[PDB]
């Protein structure tokens, strides 16, 4: 019989991309942020493929699929970054890629320290709660489904049912490992706090995107997403789904 949803989430999880960061040239903040955005664009492409393979996702209207990915790309990438940093270094360093870790000479670069602290926060929550792989996979799906327009979606019905599916799945992963309800509480608190941790990252992203002087480069993928997303965030027409 048919493979479990959880086993499917494992097979569709993208492989970690390499950055090609040349730690041979001198470390500058503009160059590091540019490299991170390049790697970001590629990871997002990877996430579109992943979302497409996601049972249920293709049943949403194309506008809604686009909306969800637009609003949650930053949280998807920050969540995986937290995961890799947890597995690869127990949350001691940011592990962006096998060829790109943030050491103390590049954490001390202008603008870096604060953004890196916010990202390590995410990592250290995985450490605190000792999150399992399966918990992580289900939570990552829920993140894709966590930020919606205040004016609702088109296929609201299909959307509500998709959320129910993956909440079930998180529940099952919790069952198959404190106490079930406490664990669910803690993990959905973690999801809720992602909105705050990531709001700050978005703010800095918008700043590096709009700042002419700074000359941080964005690939065209992200540039188009960010460019579109920015007016919606100013206008405050973006709603977090919170469990609490």
């Amino acid at each position: 019989e048919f493979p479990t949803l959880i086993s499917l989430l494992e097979v569709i999880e993208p492989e970690v991309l390499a950055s090609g960061y040349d730690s041979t040239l001198p470390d500058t903040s503009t160059r590091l942020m540019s490299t991170l955005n390049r790697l970001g664009g590629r990871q997002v492409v990877s996430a579109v493929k992943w979302a497409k393979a996601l049972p249920g996702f293709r049943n949403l209207h194309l506008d809604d699929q686009m909306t969800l990915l637009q609003y949650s790309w930053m949280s998807l990438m920050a969540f995986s970054l937290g995961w890799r940093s947890y597995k690869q270094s127990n949350g001691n360093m940011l592990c962006f890629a096998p060829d790109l870790v943030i050491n103390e000479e590049r954490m001390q670069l202008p603008y870096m320290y604060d953004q890196c602290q916010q990202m390590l926060k995410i990592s250290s929550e995985f450490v605190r709660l000792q999150v399992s792989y399966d918990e992580y996979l289900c939570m990552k799906v829920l993140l894709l489904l966590s930020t919606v327009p205040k004016d609702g979606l088109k296929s609201q019905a299909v959307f509500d049912e998709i959320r129910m599916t993956y909440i079930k799945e998180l529940g099952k992963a919790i069952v198959k490992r404190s106490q079930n309800w406490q664990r669910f509480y803690q993990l959905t608190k973690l999801l809720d706090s992602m909105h705050e941790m990531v709001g700050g990252l978005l703010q800095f992203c918008f700043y590096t995107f709009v700042n002419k002087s700074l000359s941080v480069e964005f690939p065209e993928m992200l540039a188009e997403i960010i460019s579109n997303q920015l007016p919606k965030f100013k206008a405050g027409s973006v709603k977090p789904l919170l469990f609490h």
Binding site: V48, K49, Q65, M66, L69, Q70, M221, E224
Partner: peptide
């Protein structure tokens, strides 16, 4: 609307 994103979703 973000063209590369939309295209990515419409295709492969």
């Amino acid at each position: 609307r973000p063209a590369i994103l939309y295209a990515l979703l419409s295709s492969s």
